[PDB]
Amino acid sequence: CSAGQISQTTTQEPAVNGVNAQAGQVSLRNVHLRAPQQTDYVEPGTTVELLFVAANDSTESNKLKSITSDVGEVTLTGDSTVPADGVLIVGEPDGQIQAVENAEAADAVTAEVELTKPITNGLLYDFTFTFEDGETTVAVPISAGEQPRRPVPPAGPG
Amino acid sequence: WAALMFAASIMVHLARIFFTGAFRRPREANWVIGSLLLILAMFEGFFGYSLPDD
Amino acid sequence: MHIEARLFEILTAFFALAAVVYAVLTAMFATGGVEWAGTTALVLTTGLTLITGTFFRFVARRLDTRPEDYEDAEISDGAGELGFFAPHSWWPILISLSFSTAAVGAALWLPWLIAAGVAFVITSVCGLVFEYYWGPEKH
Amino acid sequence: MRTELAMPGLQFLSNEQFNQLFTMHGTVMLLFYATPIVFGFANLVLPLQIGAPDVAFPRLNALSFWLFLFGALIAIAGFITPGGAADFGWTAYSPLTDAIHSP
Amino acid sequence: LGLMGGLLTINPIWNLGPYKPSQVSAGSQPDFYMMWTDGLIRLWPAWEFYPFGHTIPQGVWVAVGMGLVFALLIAYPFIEKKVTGDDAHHNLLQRPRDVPVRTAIGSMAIALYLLLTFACMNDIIALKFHISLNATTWIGRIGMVVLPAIVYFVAYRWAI
Amino acid sequence: QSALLRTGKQLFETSCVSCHGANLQGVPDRGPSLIGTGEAAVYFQVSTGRMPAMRGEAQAPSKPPHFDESQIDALGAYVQANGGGPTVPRDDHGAVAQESLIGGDVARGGDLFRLNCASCHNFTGKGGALSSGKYAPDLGDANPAQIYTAMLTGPQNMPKFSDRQLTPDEKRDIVAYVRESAETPSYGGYGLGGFGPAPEGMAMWIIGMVAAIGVAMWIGSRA
Amino acid sequence: GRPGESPFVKMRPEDIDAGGMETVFPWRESDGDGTTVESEHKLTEIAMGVRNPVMLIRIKPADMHRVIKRKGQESFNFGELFAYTKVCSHLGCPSSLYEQQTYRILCPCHQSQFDALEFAKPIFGPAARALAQLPITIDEDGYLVANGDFVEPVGPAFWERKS
Amino acid sequence: WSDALALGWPTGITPEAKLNRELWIGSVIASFAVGAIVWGLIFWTSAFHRKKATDTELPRQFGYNMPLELTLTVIPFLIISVLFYFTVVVQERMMHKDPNPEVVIDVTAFQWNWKFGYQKIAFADGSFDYDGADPERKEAMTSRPEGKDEHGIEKVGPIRGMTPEDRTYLNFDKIETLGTSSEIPVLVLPAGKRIEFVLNSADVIHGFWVPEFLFKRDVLPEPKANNSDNVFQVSEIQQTGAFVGRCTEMCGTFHAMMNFEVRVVEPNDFKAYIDQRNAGKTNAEALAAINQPPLAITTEPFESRRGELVPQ
Amino acid sequence: MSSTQDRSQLDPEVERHTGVDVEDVPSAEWGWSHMPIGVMHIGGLLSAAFLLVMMRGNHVGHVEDWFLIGFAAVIVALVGRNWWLRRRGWIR
Numbered sequence A: 001c002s003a004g005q006i007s008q009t010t011t012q013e014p015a016v017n018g019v020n021a022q023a024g025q026v027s028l029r030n031v032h033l034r035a036p037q038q039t040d041y042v043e044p045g046t047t048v049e050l051l052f053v054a055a056n057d058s059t060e061s062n063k064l065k066s067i068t069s070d071v072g073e074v075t076l077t078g079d080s081t082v083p084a085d086g087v088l089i090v091g092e093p094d095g096q097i098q099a100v101e102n103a104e105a106a107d108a109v110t111a112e113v114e115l116t117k118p119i120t121n122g123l124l125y126d127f128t129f130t131f132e133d134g135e136t137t138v139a140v141p142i143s144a145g146e147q148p149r150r151p152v153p154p155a156g157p158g
Numbered sequence B: 001w002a003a004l005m006f007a008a009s010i011m012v013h014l015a016r017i018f019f020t021g022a023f024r025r026p027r028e029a030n031w032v033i034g035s036l037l038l039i040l041a042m043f044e045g046f047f048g049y050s051l052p053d054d
Numbered sequence C: 001m002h003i004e005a006r007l008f009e010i011l012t013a014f015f016a017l018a019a020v021v022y023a024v025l026t027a028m029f030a031t032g033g034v035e036w037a038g039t040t041a042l043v044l045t046t047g048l049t050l051i052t053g054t055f056f057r058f059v060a061r062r063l064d065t066r067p068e069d070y071e072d073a074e075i076s077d078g079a080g081e082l083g084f085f086a087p088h089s090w091w092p093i094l095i096s097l098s099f100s101t102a103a104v105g106a107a108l109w110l111p112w113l114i115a116a117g118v119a120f121v122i123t124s125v126c127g128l129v130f131e132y133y134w135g136p137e138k139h
Numbered sequence D: 001m002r003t004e005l006a007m008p009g010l011q012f013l014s015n016e017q018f019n020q021l022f023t024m025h026g027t028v029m030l031l032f033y034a035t036p037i038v039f040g041f042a043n044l045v046l047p048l049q050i051g052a053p054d055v056a057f058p059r060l061n062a063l064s065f066w067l068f069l070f071g072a073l074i075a076i077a078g079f080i081t082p083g084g085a086a087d088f089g090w091t092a093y094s095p096l097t098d099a100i101h102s103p
Numbered sequence E: 001l002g003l004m005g006g007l008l009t010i011n012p013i014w015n016l017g018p019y020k021p022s023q024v025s026a027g028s029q030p031d032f033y034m035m036w037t038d039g040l041i042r043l044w045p046a047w048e049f050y051p052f053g054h055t056i057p058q059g060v061w062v063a064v065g066m067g068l069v070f071a072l073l074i075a076y077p078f079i080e081k082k083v084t085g086d087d088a089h090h091n092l093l094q095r096p097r098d099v100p101v102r103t104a105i106g107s108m109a110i111a112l113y114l115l116l117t118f119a120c121m122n123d124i125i126a127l128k129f130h131i132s133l134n135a136t137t138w139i140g141r142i143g144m145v146v147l148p149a150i151v152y153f154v155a156y157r158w159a160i
Numbered sequence F: 001q002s003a004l005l006r007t008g009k010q011l012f013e014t015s016c017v018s019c020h021g022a023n024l025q026g027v028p029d030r031g032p033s034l035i036g037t038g039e040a041a042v043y044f045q046v047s048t049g050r051m052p053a054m055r056g057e058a059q060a061p062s063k064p065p066h067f068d069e070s071q072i073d074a075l076g077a078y079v080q081a082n083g084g085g086p087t088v089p090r091d092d093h094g095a096v097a098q099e100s101l102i103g104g105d106v107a108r109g110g111d112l113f114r115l116n117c118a119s120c121h122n123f124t125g126k127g128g129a130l131s132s133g134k135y136a137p138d139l140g141d142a143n144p145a146q147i148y149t150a151m152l153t154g155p156q157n158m159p160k161f162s163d164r165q166l167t168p169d170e171k172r173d174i175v176a177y178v179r180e181s182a183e184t185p186s187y188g189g190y191g192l193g194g195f196g197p198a199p200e201g202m203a204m205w206i207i208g209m210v211a212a213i214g215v216a217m218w219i220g221s222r223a
Numbered sequence G: 001g002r003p004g005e006s007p008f009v010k011m012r013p014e015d016i017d018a019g020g021m022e023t024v025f026p027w028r029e030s031d032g033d034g035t036t037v038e039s040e041h042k043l044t045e046i047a048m049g050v051r052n053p054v055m056l057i058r059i060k061p062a063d064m065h066r067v068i069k070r071k072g073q074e075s076f077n078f079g080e081l082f083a084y085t086k087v088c089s090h091l092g093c094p095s096s097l098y099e100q101q102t103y104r105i106l107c108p109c110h111q112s113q114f115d116a117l118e119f120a121k122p123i124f125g126p127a128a129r130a131l132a133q134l135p136i137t138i139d140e141d142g143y144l145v146a147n148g149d150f151v152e153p154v155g156p157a158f159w160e161r162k163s
Numbered sequence H: 001w002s003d004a005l006a007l008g009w010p011t012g013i014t015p016e017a018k019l020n021r022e023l024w025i026g027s028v029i030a031s032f033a034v035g036a037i038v039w040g041l042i043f044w045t046s047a048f049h050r051k052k053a054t055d056t057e058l059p060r061q062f063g064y065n066m067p068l069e070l071t072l073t074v075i076p077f078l079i080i081s082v083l084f085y086f087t088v089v090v091q092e093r094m095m096h097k098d099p100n101p102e103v104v105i106d107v108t109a110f111q112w113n114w115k116f117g118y119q120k121i122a123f124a125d126g127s128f129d130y131d132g133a134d135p136e137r138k139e140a141m142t143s144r145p146e147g148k149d150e151h152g153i154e155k156v157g158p159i160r161g162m163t164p165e166d167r168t169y170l171n172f173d174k175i176e177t178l179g180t181s182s183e184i185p186v187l188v189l190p191a192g193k194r195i196e197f198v199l200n201s202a203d204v205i206h207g208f209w210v211p212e213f214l215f216k217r218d219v220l221p222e223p224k225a226n227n228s229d230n231v232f233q234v235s236e237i238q239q240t241g242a243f244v245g246r247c248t249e250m251c252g253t254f255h256a257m258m259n260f261e262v263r264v265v266e267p268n269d270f271k272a273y274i275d276q277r278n279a280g281k282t283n284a285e286a287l288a289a290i291n292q293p294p295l296a297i298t299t300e301p302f303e304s305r306r307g308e309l310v311p312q
Numbered sequence I: 001m002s003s004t005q006d007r008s009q010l011d012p013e014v015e016r017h018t019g020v021d022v023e024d025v026p027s028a029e030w031g032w033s034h035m036p037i038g039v040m041h042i043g044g045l046l047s048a049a050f051l052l053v054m055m056r057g058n059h060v061g062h063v064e065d066w067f068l069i070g071f072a073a074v075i076v077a078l079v080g081r082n083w084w085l086r087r088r089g090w091i092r
């Protein structure tokens, strides 16, 4: 009776770095920050990108995506009202394929944030995604999409 | 394999003697020392397969 | 064994008729011709009953009217030495357990538990068959 | 299955737990209660009814019972497994039964 | 023994890498003779006592269990003679059926030993025979008090 | 590719939208969202066959794949385009790399396997048991791409080994060790599975002890 | 797994990804690579330390809200990174098995599970004491460093404990 | 009286359903007559109790009434023969297989939901120059020049040269009304027209039932290779509105979650719907545009939650 | 016919005059044949108590506790039935 109403397989989040925020009609999937850090912190004043996918649940739509801004002044370049029983893919997560030579509306709604606050990988930073339906804090992580190991200096025994 | 058969045959011999009553009045001390022998065999195999640091 | 053979002869007649009619009406008037599953099953159940009935008829012709087959047969007529009916035996349960250990080995695809269940089955079938033939121990 | 079906919602059973129930209920009742009990009654009175002392192969009919009992148990054994018993109904139709479906 | 040394592989230490505290496998079993001690360790239900500023880990439970097992095994003939009352010089064995209580007790003890031995192997039993690991652990826990009683009753009646 | 994306979408729509809802968002309490899972996850999971899954239980078992390599690639490309994530390795031609994933070093691969993989699988990649009905499966069926992608995407109750955590060279070494341990013949006889104590004790008790007892019964006299 | 040279390499939080487990060891700058003879003995000591190995777990941000924290171990975690001793609290075998989406640290020796979401308290098996939690953080350059020592003895329990 | 005596048969919405319901009413009449007479016989012989007045004298002890046996073994044969003749004439209108369907729906039934393709539409009155999509049908012929061996094998494929995972039998169309787990599919059909259903299954055998059609068919994976007549026609659908439809087989775990709808709208409504779907719009959007509720009104989507006591 | 009857004189030493009888255990004189019923009753009661006590443990599970409850309940039911029947003289 591992197959009962509470089963391990069904109640599993995706094995992805981005968090999931189902609150609100539009569901946020694989929401993370591309913020390549060269040191302990990503210093304020540097622009890091905000990846996620906004999937519409209802066909009756919530395609506004008004502000979705928090501490950092997230700006949505090439903003569009995409979600209509479909996906709004704000950016290009590492490994993303354009899927066609051309493109629609230039960039596909790329969200970029001027930090105004140090951030580091491993921490969770709250972002308030607000559609016309409602607002939800998501606690976005920092994800190193596909970058390999940065060479750490060799150690001199002492 | 000889260690495993040693343990298994000690166990089977213990079963035989216990079930056939080969320990009462005489041979009771024989049963006692046989029990000590079984314990020693158990720990001997324990130290044996533990001997090659693995 | 006239009635015993004739029962299977009747079953053979009916099953042969069913197989023939199914084969014909499936070769024609079916979406994809002969079904080839029902046809074969009907043909070989006809074969089942045919084998049994043929053996029963051979035996009926080979044997004179038994008291069992003979109406107006007194109990004393059949009274005599009935043959060997196996008394108590614990080999059937061992055979069942061995076949169950082979079956679980087949279900859970464990070649080692199949191999052992089959060994187990051979041993227990040998025990059952030799149960009443293992001569006295010769020391 | 009956308690679950009393109310429209899935009160206490999951979809696959219910599917295991009618699968095993159907087979247990037929193949482990109905088909093995005709030979239960046959072994009971058939030799008596024809005047015989015993069945033709009385060690064989002993094997038949134990094959029934142990064969039945290993079918019920699907429940103790974490996945459960067979999802597919008693009929166990082909595509649903292959390794791809109900693995 | 030579045939089995040839044809059957025992303890492939080359497969089993060198000991490192940070590394481990899933099997982690001792030979079948210590498998009952290991199974006792696995099955015993994590009962720990914390006296004044001290700890009494679950290891002591299994240690005392082994001590009791060995003490009872060593002292059985004297226990049996104290219980029954027979100190007569016995040179003729008695068939296990002819002594229902002792054969029943031995069957009960063998059942407990087999339960513990398979509890130690519950990991591989769960892996191969598809049974949840928690289910195997709790089957062992319940059986080690149920299975000995069942086997005792069955063996007693079987002997009679 | 356009047609590859279209084929992946068509397969997705008639295979998994019931439990990975259309738009790749996950169906609450039936399946996780596939956004960000990537092409490697799709390749491993569908090729091992786990994904045409017909039950919610402790663990999704392996099974014959329901799609051929081309359809696996189509589904993987569709999922990668929708979400974007890890990609399965490929060789010079374009096919999923099998031999290229065999790392040169096998001692290093074995050390890494023992530190990370043997934790649950085995000393040599046989299976292992887990908490509640789960289990780490035997690795002898997995091919180098399947092993590499299994590490790349933690399939289920398995830690997700990123390239940063296990550089592709380390993963290649682990793949080499897995394949070598799986394809290597047992020296010293029939390795009874791969678990020492339990299969060895059973084989003793069944082969050696029945032989000894039967020989003793032959030599001696019943009484 | 490099055979002998630079066996231990500094680590960064970005290296792990959500639902990831990595076995880490207490490496000091003085304990440089294994090239020298002075090194390769400190490194061997680190590797052979019974209480040295730790498992660093990246809790999925979605499940970060299910985390319960122990007394005095509330700030030990660095964001979504939790460092628990691998040595099982009961008889000291490593608890190396990790189940993500269940967050259960399983020990192979005697099948004991610890709930990593909560403080690694045993929710099954013989173990009765939670695994010790290592304080962790990032120094300059972002490399992960222990922010202290275990607030309790880390190996298996013994008579002189809990005081 | 007819509804009560039909034993819960939904009054058909197509002439085939009407005729089948009439046959069912007749069959139930005959069965209830037989049951009434037999139960009367049983409750009458239950009046032959062992009366205390019965002295030491046993009954007639007759048995073996050959003429009565002949009568009661010939009459049932005639009854079943009449039933069989009616059954055959009714079955004749099970699939008339009219070579000129007015709308053809490609009913793909995959694992735990439905998809409707609208393969072709050709109104007899004259309209709907529409067709399906010949592309998207990609085979899986594993005709590699060489396999694992060095030479000679040149394996073509397991079955008829194709691998089991082929899905060439599956036909695809431009307008696909796929059903999501959270959005029950609604196949909209024109009222008054001949509607053919080309049935197929993606993964597993299962069933397609519209209780109001008084007819069901088993969507098979490869019906043509299995010697099955998956395709079946409905001459007309008079009544408009939404009719629930179930899956009437075993599919897997979520077999009870395959409910769909068939929404019979007027021919003009179907014109507007198909035009607005050719224009990029979803099924719900097209329904709203033709001013009909977008979501399945006869059945809500099932809660994807595994049950009530699950902690969300 | 090729079998010789056996004469056995085993040394005896409780005298079996109380406890079990040959009609109940045919080989009562040949070995230990009687376990006091109190021993088995107390053993069953303590087994049930142990099963119940195992509910207290470090397991978040609940079907485990329910299985313990069921097994302890059936053990206690068997012990109670046996004790009641023997109290009344094996009646009902």
Ligand SMILES: CCCCCCCCCCCCCCCC(=O)O[C@H](COC(=O)CCCCCCC[C@@H](C)CCCCCCCCC)COP(=O)(O)O[C@H]1[C@H](O)[C@H](O)[C@H](O)[C@@H](O)[C@@H]1O
Residues within 6 Å of the ligand: C111, C112, C113, C115, C116, C117, E007, E008, F125, F126, F138, F139, F140, F141, F181, F182, F183, F185, F186, F189, F190, F191, F192, F193, F202, F203, F206, F207
């Ligand atoms: C009586 C004395 C004789 C003793 C037996 C001696 C047999 C000698 C055999 C010949 C020499 C040694 C061959 C060594 C080559 C070799 O090892 O043999 C494997 C086979 O292995 C299997 O499957 C088992 C096949 C079934 C046959 C053997 C069964 C014998 C058992 C029953 C003996 C013990 C008794 C236990 C009784 C049980 C009942 C208890 C009540 C074959 O390869 P494979 O199959 O592919 O192994 C997989 C890797 O590939 C893959 O990666 C890896 O991941 C794995 O999956 C691995 O299995």
Ligand SMILES: CCCCCCCCCCCCCCCC(=O)O[C@H](COC(=O)CCCCCCC[C@@H](C)CCCCCCCCC)COP(=O)(O)O[C@H]1[C@H](O)[C@H](O)[C@H](O)[C@@H](O)[C@@H]1O
Residues within 6 Å of the ligand: A001, A002, A003, A004, A006, A007, A008, D079, D080, D081, D082, E114, E115, E118, E132, E134, E135, E136, E138, E139, E140, E142, E143, E144, E146, E147, F058, F131, F132, F133, I061, I062, I063, I064, I065, I067
């Ligand atoms: C030596 C063996 C003989 C033993 C004799 C003693 C007999 C007494 C057996 C006692 C059985 C105790 C069973 C209960 C144990 C227990 O408490 O664990 C459960 C699992 O229940 C179960 O299946 C119960 C299965 C019980 C079947 C027992 C079968 C007896 C067999 C072994 C007898 C054959 C013996 C063969 C002898 C061989 C002879 C060799 C010579 C739950 O685990 P879990 O899986 O985590 O479930 C989670 C949900 O709860 C949660 O909602 C959900 O959310 C999920 O998380 C889900 O996973």
Ligand SMILES: CCCCCCCC/C=C\CCCCCCCC(=O)OC[C@H](COP(=O)(O)OCCN)OC(=O)CCCCCCCCCCCCCCC
Residues within 6 Å of the ligand: A001, A004, A005, A006, D012, D013, D014, D017, H309, H310, H311, I060, I061, I062, I063, I064, I066, I067, I069, I070, I071, I074
């Ligand atoms: C004849 C009896 C017939 C009884 C048949 C009943 C079968 C139905 C069982 C499971 C159905 C699938 C549901 C699967 C999920 C469970 C339901 C639930 O959620 O119920 C609430 C809590 C747990 O809360 P939780 O959220 O699971 O989390 C927890 C920690 N996190 O348990 C409770 O109080 C209520 C108890 C729930 C199940 C306990 C059943 C176990 C064994 C019964 C007796 C065995 C007797 C042996 C005799 C020798």
Ligand code: HEC
Residues within 6 Å of the ligand: A009, A010, A012, A013, A014, A015, A016, F012, F015, F016, F019, F020, F030, F031, F032, F034, F037, F041, F042, F043, F045, F046, F050, F051, F052, F053, F054, F055, F056, F059, F060, F075, F153, F154, F155, F156, H111
């Ligand atoms: C419920 C039935 C089911 C269906 C059918 C199914 N999935 Fe899934 N999927 C799951 C579950 C449950 C998980 C997570 C647990 C697991 O994978 O065992 C999952 C996870 C996945 C993953 C891995 C996610 C990760 O984070 O690693 C991939 C990739 C995936 N699904 C793709 C597919 C594709 C492609 C198909 C169709 C070819 C499909 N699935 C069909 C239920 C299903």
Ligand code: HEM
Residues within 6 Å of the ligand: B003, B004, B006, B041, B044, B045, B047, B048, B049, B050, B051, B052, E011
């Ligand atoms: C008395 C009963 C004994 C038992 C039960 C026993 C058991 C064992 C076992 C099981 C092993 C493991 C072998 C392996 O893993 O390959 C072992 C190893 C060993 N035994 Fe014993 N042994 C016994 C007596 C002896 C004796 C008398 C000697 C010396 C004369 C001895 C010398 C060794 C050595 C040197 C090893 C190490 C072999 C290795 O590491 O592979 N043992 N023993």
Ligand SMILES: CCCCCCCCCCCCCCCC(=O)OC[C@H](C)OC(=O)CCCCCCCC[C@@H](C)CCCCCCCC
Residues within 6 Å of the ligand: A001, A002, D073, D076, D077, D079, D080, I063, I066, I071, I074, I075
């Ligand atoms: C006292 C000892 C005697 C028993 C006393 C009366 C014993 C009476 C036992 C009532 C049992 C009640 C259970 C209530 C279920 C529950 O609420 O928990 C749900 C749980 C989550 O679901 C499961 O996990 C599996 C549940 C199914 C159990 C399959 C067992 C199949 C057994 C086979 C493996 C054959 C074994 C051979 C057995 C051989 C014996 C044959 C009878």
Ligand SMILES: *C(=O)CCCCCCCCCCCCCCC
Residues within 6 Å of the ligand: A001, A002, A003, D017, D020, D021, D079, D080, D081, D082, D083, D084, D085
């Ligand atoms: C998951 O591991 C199993 C799910 C099965 C749940 C439903 C169980 C139905 C009851 C079965 C009865 C077993 C035999 C009872 C013996 C008294």
Ligand code: FES
Residues within 6 Å of the ligand: G088, G089, G090, G091, G092, G093, G094, G107, G108, G109, G110, G111, G112, G125, G126, G127
């Ligand atoms: S050694 Fe970890 S639970 Fe016992």
Ligand SMILES: [Cu+2]
Residues within 6 Å of the ligand: H206, H207, H246, H247, H248, H249, H250, H251, H255, H256, H258
């Ligand atoms: Cu259905």
Ligand SMILES: [Cu+2]
Residues within 6 Å of the ligand: H109, H110, H111, H112, H113, H204, H205, H206, H207, H250, H251
């Ligand atoms: Cu279906």
